[PDB]
Amino acid sequence: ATVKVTLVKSLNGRLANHKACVKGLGLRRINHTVEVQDTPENRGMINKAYYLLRVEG
Amino acid sequence: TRNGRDSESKRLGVKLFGGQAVKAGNILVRLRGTKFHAGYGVGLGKDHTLFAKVDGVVKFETKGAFGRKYVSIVAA
RNA sequence: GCUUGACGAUCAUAGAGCGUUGGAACCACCUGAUCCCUUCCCGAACUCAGAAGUGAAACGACGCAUCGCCGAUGGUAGUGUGGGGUCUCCCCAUGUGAGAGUAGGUCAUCGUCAAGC
RNA sequence: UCCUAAAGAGUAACGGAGGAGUACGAAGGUGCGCUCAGACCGGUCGGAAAUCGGUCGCAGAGUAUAAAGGCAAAAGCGCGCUUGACUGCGAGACAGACACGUCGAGCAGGUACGAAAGUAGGUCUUAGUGAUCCGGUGGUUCUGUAUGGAAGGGCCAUCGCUCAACGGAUAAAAGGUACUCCGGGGAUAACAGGCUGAUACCGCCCAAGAGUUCAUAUCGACGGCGGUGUUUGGCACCUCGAUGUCGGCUCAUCACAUCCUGGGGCUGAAGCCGGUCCCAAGGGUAUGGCUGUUCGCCAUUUAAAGUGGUACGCGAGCUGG
RNA sequence: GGGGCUCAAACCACACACCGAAGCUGCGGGUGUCACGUAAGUGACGCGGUAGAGGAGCGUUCUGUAAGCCUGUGAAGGUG
RNA sequence: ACCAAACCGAUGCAAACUCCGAAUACCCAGAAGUGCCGAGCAUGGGAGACACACGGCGGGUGCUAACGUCCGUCGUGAAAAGGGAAACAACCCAGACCGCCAGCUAAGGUCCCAAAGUUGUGGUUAAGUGGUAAACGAUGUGGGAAGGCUUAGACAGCUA
RNA sequence: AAUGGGUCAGCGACUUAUAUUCAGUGGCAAGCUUAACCGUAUAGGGUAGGCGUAGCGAAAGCGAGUCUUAAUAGGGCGUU
């Protein structure tokens, strides 16, 4: 229904594809938390950048 | 006994891949000798260039004996 | 309704290989070239007057599974990303994932159309 | 044209492989006709093989030409017509910095062909090429320096010569400099440093073997694995608004992989001498004849005349062969 | 890296703490953009930077404003 | 007794071999959300650049040598400071608008130099291994599966 | 351990002319603006000229239309 992700690592040396998954998910800097809808087209951006994030649910 | 002198790399290949809308003149496969064959509305130019002769979308079927990889455009 | 025609869907699970046949319809021959012509010389090519003959060869469906051909599952190799290492190479997380090989189907499955029984 | 090239394009190297500077009036269009090569075998001139006659065939043939990719609806030959190897164009694409380049119908001029649906704007495809400016030629309706004309120019078609350093400096283009000059560079060589260690050097591992028997007292072919930075390289990282050679002289300083002296193990070490391997860097470790020499070769010594590093130590210490 | 460390101050696991950046948060600070605000007014996202593009300024000398204004009760200049 | 192409089976290996064949990448269409208020495109004004470096990966070249060199693709430095790697453009963490004698973390660390555990539980290692190294060589020690000889009396030690 | 600078104080490097293009800002507007020169002179006169209002074509030319070909048949450029 709603998931909330936090950005826990940086975007600096990351691939241009992966940081576009994090910007397109609503996130801006470290420890920023957004509330994300749990559509699978939204969840795929959570999975392509799984290592940069923390997904509380 | 002396190497050099490669050629200038003719840009062959499947342009306009197999789900795309076409107009009725589009070069559809650049080709070095009909690796792909001519389906319903496509044309087969002189150097074996496939070209759309009608509008629609390109299909890329495999059909028939001899294992022909066809390029046909369906008006959809 | 089946036999068989007539171009086609699908393309070696449909393919090749080893028996029985069909004569009425169809089909190949056959009898011969006179009247069309076919000949790099020829009526076996093919053009035909044909229907005296013939069902083996010719082909056709219709038999029979060795061989080709398809082919799991599971594993393995590879590999995108992230992180390691003893870093010309591999491992870990995660996503994906063959090729080859491993019981065996089968003498295929379809569609319209017609003369005959 | 293939590879490199990482399963879309593209993609470099003085990287690995080959080709082209054309052919074709049929080797094109079309009409028509028509489908390989292979083994298998029949000897009185060919006998591996031809003429090809017919049996199992299972693209392996052929394509004007390199290689790749393609083919039978043949994308090879025969033969007729004898021309679509058409004229005007051209929707739309592909390639693309630009100039270039590549692919592509319908109406007509009009067409070969087929009796016809229809196929044909060259060849199975991709090389077979060259801009502009000047000239040459044939058209033209255009221009035509007062006017009528011509000349010259323009447009359209086509030729040249030669740009192969092949986006082509000019119609026309070789050298020397140790007599040199300037502007720059450590974008770049020589010396030295640095990276690396093929190469050199020194250890080690298996042990065929010789050592008269006996692999290992000594030595070791075939191969193996390392160390040292010790020189021949390789690199071009520092240095070109300067880091001035080789050798001798003078002075050194460190290493130990030890030349002498000191302590030992083993010996194919009787002894005298040695061989070989450990341990050991305290101190010692020539003089001359030749040559610019380092070295080297020689004469005579010595207990011994060691091997390396130090910008191949040392020229604001010397010399200057 | 040094001192120094041997049931470790080493290595292998696991657990829990802590320290550590200009990161992040707290708190105070312009307008950079943008949306709103009949334009007081807050919001939101930013704000490392060479070549380079854009935008905004300060100060000097001269001319007009200036026959003004200041100045010998003290100019410019110099030093605090 | 020599030999003999081809054929049957077993068995390898190719950048210029392929009966096969991915992951990824690329092209396309449709969708939610996010975008700093835009990202994309088009025409104009002004540029600068057209000697890149190193690191990971995928290769050529070399000796699968070089901080060698040539490509592809990333990240960084160029043009990026701060913390870690002792010191160390290019590696790890992270991208500094200004102030604070506030607090949480990242990489990395917690005995002293030096900020934080002489922290807990369980093992290993005696070499200062840690804190440089290869073939190969050794009753160094920890753990684990198995085997043969095993009181009808084994392996090294006594009186036919 | 690449260049330059011993130091101080002065000086020392994107200017000017004429053509032109683009932007901003103005005046006039289907028009706009003058150049030499005249001028009791930054006024006023002077509209020669320049650009704009129409293009297409090599050109004659035709014009909201040519070229081409025997072809008003087929595309490029322009157009309230």
Side-chain angles (χ1 to χ4, degrees), chain B residues 14-37:
Chain B
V14 176
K15 291 94 178 69
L16 195 69
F17 282 92
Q20 303 185 10
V22 304
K23 295 292 177 67
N26 290 332
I27 285 170
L28 187 55
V29 178
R30 284 286 190 182
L31 191 55
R32 193 51 63 208
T34 186
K35 184 194 292 292
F36 296 96
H37 282 83

Side-chain angles (χ1 to χ4, degrees), chain A residues 5 7 11 16-28 32 34-37 39 41-46 49 53:
Chain A
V5 299
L7 181 64
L11 288 318
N17 195 6
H18 295 295
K19 65 174 73 181
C21 296
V22 174
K23 181 171 80 174
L25 201 63
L27 295 169
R28 308 289 286 168
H32 179 63
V34 299
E35 284 90 6
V36 164
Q37 295 291 318
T39 63
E41 51 202 357
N42 223 168
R43 176 74 68 180
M45 310 177 78
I46 298 172
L53 302 177

Side-chain angles (χ1 to χ4, degrees), chain A residues 2-19:
Chain A
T2 303
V3 75
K4 56 178 70 175
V5 299
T6 306
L7 181 64
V8 300
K9 290 179 182 176
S10 286
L11 288 318
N12 299 133
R14 306 292 179 255
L15 290 167
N17 195 6
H18 295 295
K19 65 174 73 181

